[PDB]
Amino acid sequence: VIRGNEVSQIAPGQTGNIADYNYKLPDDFTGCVIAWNSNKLDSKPSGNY
Amino acid sequence: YAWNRKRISNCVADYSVIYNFAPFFAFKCYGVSPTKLNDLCFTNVYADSFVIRGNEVSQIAPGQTGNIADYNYKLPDDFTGCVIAWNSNKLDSKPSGNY
Amino acid sequence: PTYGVGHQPYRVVVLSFELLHAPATVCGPKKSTNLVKNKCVNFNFNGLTG
């Protein structure tokens, strides 16, 4: 689960913050990337830490 | 019709902090990649600011016609750079109407 | 929940398929047909036809 600003970062040949330190896709990736919003279950009034 | 134009000159621009400043979907660039703006560097940077309707967000493109692009703000045919667009429902909406 | 729409959480599921010369250990629900030989026909072997 990541924020909505890094949906475009999940791509082969991509850099940034998540793609450079956390999760890097291979340059010959064969598969599918599935992302959807989870605002109902991954949100708290006091902050989800 | 009277959109602001801000000239940015003689400083150092860090382009990685834009994502933590506004809640935008696509950091829409045309001739450059967003993550390689730190290594290469340009001559001058321009900054513009305006608010349009949701039906004319797709009109912010070179070689485009319509209402904004034909009478209000026409991008050049050889435009390069990044365009940032995010909604302002929680900041510029009024119950009687934002006129 | 009071943030903008560009800072909402997103559930990301990454699925990857192996496309190599290995035999198909796991794959989808398709029906197999009995094998005959010595005829100009069309075949289908592990996803590739001919």
Question: A37 burial class (0-12, 13-18, 19+ CB within 10 angstroms)?
Answer: middle
Inter-chain CB proximity B24 and C6 less than 8 Å = yes
* Phi, then psi, of B36 in degrees rounded to 5: -110, 20
| Strand, helix or coil for residue A28 | coil
**Chain B residues touching residue A14 (CB < 8 angstroms):** 35
Closest CA of chain A from B24, distance in Å? 8
B75: CB partners within 8 A, 6+ apart: B60, B61, B62, B64, B69
Candidate from B23, B24, B87 with C-beta closest to C3? B23
SS3 of B71, please?
A: helix
Confirm if A5 and A19 have CB atoms less than 8 A apart: no
Comparing CA positions, the residue from B25, C7, B87 lying closest to residue A42 is C7
How many Å apart are CA B37 and CA B43, to the nearest integer? 13
* Contact assessment for residue A18 and residue B35, using Cβ atoms and an 8 Å cutoff: no
Q: What spatial distance separates the first Cα and last Cα of chain B, rounded to whole Å? A: 15
- A32 Ramachandran zone, left/alpha/beta (phi>0; psi -120 to 50): beta
Flag whether residue B25 sits within 8 Å of chain A, measured between CB atoms.
yes
B10 Rama sector, left if φ>0, alpha if ψ -120 to 50, beta otherwise: left
- The position carrying tokens 């689960």 is A1
Specified resolution (Å): 3.1
Specify the experimental method: cryo-EM
Subunit partners of chain B (3 or more CB pairs within 8 A): A, C
Structure-token pair, residue B73: 């703000």
* Residue B6 and residue B49 in contact, taking contact as beta carbons nearer than 8 Å: yes
